[PDB]
Ligand binder design. Structure first.
Ligand SMILES: FC(F)(F)C1=NCCNC=C1
Length: 580
């Protein structure tokens, strides 16, 4: 029978189904391996090994045939199997994939593209079966990735190697390495890596390249940099020396941060940029565009009554237009970047901008996990933005859910559906546990420290609606009891799911969310007690009510003084509501 197209992330620009599917044989003829991108071919080899698919050395016409290469390779049998499809006319990083009557063909516009075709290929195949499809695919935004920019417990080395492979698998191509643990990033910002630190950095650098990730080395000399006279000169050379020493280990992307600094003059920040850009970036000729974050980096701090402040205005004139400029949106952590905000800032800097989006980062509100999708990001932003990065959580495993959606948003922006993306993330990442994780993660999408920092999808919004509806039914004495029954079932479901997650989540996830699992179980029991209160009072029964009321205060006080935080406006607020 038919072979269905599995979930893919990101969603490819164009995918047509052309056959029923077929089973890839025990082993295959691989064609083009000698001409095609070395990293694409190694990804392919690893996948084939991990799935017990051998490679014939002698062509066997009984065996499935896999042909891989770039446009700029001369592989006639690739064009033959593509049978009309082509990557020739796509942007950079695009590719074409055709799977049909026993052949798979992958043609990248460039090697990045080819590597990305392999990542699609990997997603399409299940228990050796592939659908017969026809894909041409390319990204909306051209830098797409992560900045390691949060505070708190930095990621381990093993976390980073895991993330980088993950970024490659979801077609993210940028990783800004600016950890606050690392002295060689800020304090000690002059000063090459020791010797004891070189083997670690080298592994980060090489893993990145192997997965088509731009390892951007982030530097932050605001701590103590001198701009004037001999000191200015000496420090500029320390900057150059430092970048040379990283150039020498393989680094070909650099970012310079001015976000925390004493001497706060735009003209001086932009001169150090412009000179580095000339004397280093351009001189080397294989270094990617320099990146910077300026001292004013949110619309709040950058603009006043539609007019740039002094800093921004000066920085914006002075700074070379080849330089990439990061800004976080309307504020540092904000609901939205609407098109008008992008336009405004893009206009001022007179260029396509770079986004530093502070979600899912939780460093400002550590008890809550941010497990929701990219949200409030206007689906036309690519008109003014061609570099998009997320600042994730200290919790690397669970950051994968938001990051997975950032991958769809930034690759295929027209078609981005936050809720569809959110479900696909959980489905793809959590397997046999996805339905349970969805129940739980549903209550942990929304960030709000109640001062300055608010972003993300509202928690569990269907359930909020049923809770509001229950209060209307009660307070205009209409019948409520179908709903009450329905809500007993929801709260039971919450508890069931979180218990199943505690029992079955692998440690790598469990250990980042177990406090919250417990917290949501508690609030769920208090929610259950809160309906017990409502039933008791509608049956005028003080015994059952004062008993239930005690149980509900009990769960609320546990949650209120636990470190963990979750479902503040839904599962937690329901209990507060019932007790008033
Ligand atoms: F002020 C600090 F930089 F230390 C800080 N700011 C944002 C909130 N998260 C943790 C620390």
């Amino acid at each position: 029978n038919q072979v269905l197209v599995p979930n893919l992330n990101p969603t490819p620009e164009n995918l047509e189904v052309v056959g029923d599917g077929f089973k890839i044989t025990s082993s295959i003829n691989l064609v083009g391996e000698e001409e095609a991108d070395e990293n694409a071919v190694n990804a392919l080899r690893e996948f084939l090994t991990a799935n017990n698919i051998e490679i014939n050395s002698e062509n066997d016409p009984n065996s499935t045939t896999l042909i891989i290469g770039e446009v700029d390779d001369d592989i006639p049998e690739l064009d033959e199997a593509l049978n009309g499809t082509t990557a020739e006319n796509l942007k950079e990083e695009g590719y074409a994939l055709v799977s049909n009557d026993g052949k798979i063909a992958i043609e990248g516009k460039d090697g990045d593209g080819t590597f990305y075709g392999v990542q699609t290929f990997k997603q399409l195949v299940k228990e050796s079966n592939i659908p017969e499809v026809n894909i041409t695919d390319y990204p909306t935004v051209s830098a797409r990735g992560i900045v390691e920019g949060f505070y708190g417990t930095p990621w381990t080395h093993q976390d980073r190697l895991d993330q980088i492979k993950f970024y490659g698998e979801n077609k993210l191509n940028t990783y800004i390495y600016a950890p606050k643990d690392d002295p060689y990033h800020r304090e000690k910002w002059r000063e090459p890596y020791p010797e004891s630190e070189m083997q670690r950095m080298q592994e980060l650098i090489n893993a990145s390249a192997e997965n088509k990730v731009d390892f951007v080395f982030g530097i932050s000399p605001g701590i103590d940099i001198r701009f004037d006279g001999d000191a200015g000169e000496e420090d500029f050379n320390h900057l150059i020396t430092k970048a040379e020493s990283l150039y020498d280990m393989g680094v070909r992307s650099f970012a310079i941060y001015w976000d925390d600094i004493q001497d706060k003059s735009a003209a001086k920040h932009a001169q150090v940029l412009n000179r580095f850009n000339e004397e280093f970036v351009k001189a080397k000729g294989d270094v990617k565009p320099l990146i910077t974050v300026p001292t004013e980096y949110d619309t709040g701090a950058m603009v006043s009554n539609g007019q740039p402040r002094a800093y921004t205005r000066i920085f914006a004139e002075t700074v070379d237009p080849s330089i990439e400029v990061m800004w976080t949106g309307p504020g540092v952590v904000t609901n939205e970047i609407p098109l008008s905000d992008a336009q405004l800032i893009s206009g001022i800097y007179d260029r396509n901008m770079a986004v530093w989006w502070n979600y899912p980062v939780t460093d400002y509100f550590k008890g809550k996990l941010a497990l929701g999708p990219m949200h409030g990001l206007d689906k036309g932003l690519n008109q003014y933005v061609d570099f998009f990065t997320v600042n994730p959580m200290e919790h690397a495993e669970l950051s994968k859910i938001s990051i997975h959606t950032a991958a769809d948003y930034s690759w295929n922006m027209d078609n981005y559906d936050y809720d569809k993306a959110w479900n696909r993330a959980i489905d793809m990442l959590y397997g046999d546990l996805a339905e349970d994780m969805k129940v739980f993660a549903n209550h942990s999408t929304r960030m709000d420290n109640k001062t300055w920092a608010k972003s993300g999808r509202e928690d569990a919004p269907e359930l909020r609606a049923k809770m509001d509806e229950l209060w209307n039914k009660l307070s205009s004495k209409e019948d409520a009891s179908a709903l009450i029954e329905e809500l007993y079932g929801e709260f039971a479901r919450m508890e069931e799911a979180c218990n199943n997650l505690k029992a079955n989540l692998p440690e790598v996830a469990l250990e980042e969310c177990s406090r919250q699992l417990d917290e949501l179980i508690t609030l769920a029991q208090g929610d259950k007690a809160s309906l017990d209160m409502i039933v008791a009072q509608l049956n005028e029964d003080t015994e059952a009510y004062e008993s239930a009321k005690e149980i509900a205060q009990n769960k609320l006080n546990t949650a209120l003084s636990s470190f963990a935080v979750i479902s503040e406006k839904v599962a937690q607020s329901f209990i507060q509501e019932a007790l008033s």
